[PDB]
């Protein structure tokens, strides 16, 4: 999914 | 010269989280000029060298998502040059590498060579300042 610092 | 934001690179460093904000300012000037051909090849030689002027701002501390503290660096290049970079993975990877490499020297010491680039965030800090 994503990184823990954007805006599985 | 107040840098306008570009992208943001999450990495780590033995003691914890490091974010590099790659910005750009029209006033730097670029390593004008060359195309993919010449510089894919002149890394193998040329230096030193070496061009790619970049300003490497002081560290500044900021909070991460979980509320723990971490370190952020702002690196500026030329705007005109930045736009070249943005539709080329190789050049991007190069700028990141020079950015980590030149930072390690100025501030010491260890940085993770391996990294991630954020997708929805262009900058972690404010951002400052700089050296007009």
Author numbering:
A (entry chain D): 6 to 12, 96
B (entry chain B): 48 to 179
Question: Can I see the authors' text?
Answer:
The R2TP complex is found in organisms from yeast to humans, and consists of the AAA+ ATPases Rvb1 and Rvb2 (human: RUVBL1 and RUVBL2), a TPR-containing protein, Tah1 (human: Spagh or RPAP3), and Pih1 (also known as NOP17 and Pih1D1, but referred to as Pih1 henceforth; Kakihara and Houry, 2012; Te et al., 2007). Pih1 is the multipoint scaffold of the R2TP complex, coupling the Rvb1-Rvb2 hetero-dodecamer, the Hsp90 chaperone machinery (via Tah1 in yeast or Spagh/RPAP3 in metazoa), and the TTT (Tel2-Tti1-Tti2) complex implicated in activation and stabilization of PIKKs (Hurov et al., 2010; Kakihara and Houry, 2012). The biological roles ascribed to the R2TP complex are directly associated with its ability to interact with the Hsp90 chaperone system and function as an Hsp90 cochaperone (Boulon et al., 2010; Izumi et al., 2012; Takai et al., 2010). Here we present crystal structures of Hsp90-Tah1-Pih1, Hsp90-Spagh/RPAP3, and Pih1-Tel2 complexes that together define key structural links within the R2TP core in yeast and in animals and reveal how R2TP connects the Hsp90 chaperone system to the TTT complex involved in PIKK activation.
Interaction with Tel2 involves the N-terminal segment of Pih1 (Horejsí et al., 2010), which contains a conserved region of unknown structure (henceforth, PIH domain). We determined the crystal structure of the mouse PIH domain1–200 with single-wavelength anomalous dispersion phasing of Tel2-peptide cocrystals (see below) grown with SeMet protein (see Experimental Procedures) and used this to phase the mPih47–179 apo and SELDpSDDEF peptide-bound structures, which were refined to 2.1 and 3.3 Å, respectively. The interaction of the PIH domain and the Tel2 phosphopeptide is highly unusual when compared with other known phosphopeptide binding domains. An additional source of specificity may be contributed by the hydrophobic interaction of Tel2-Phe 496, positioned +4 relative to the phosphoserine.
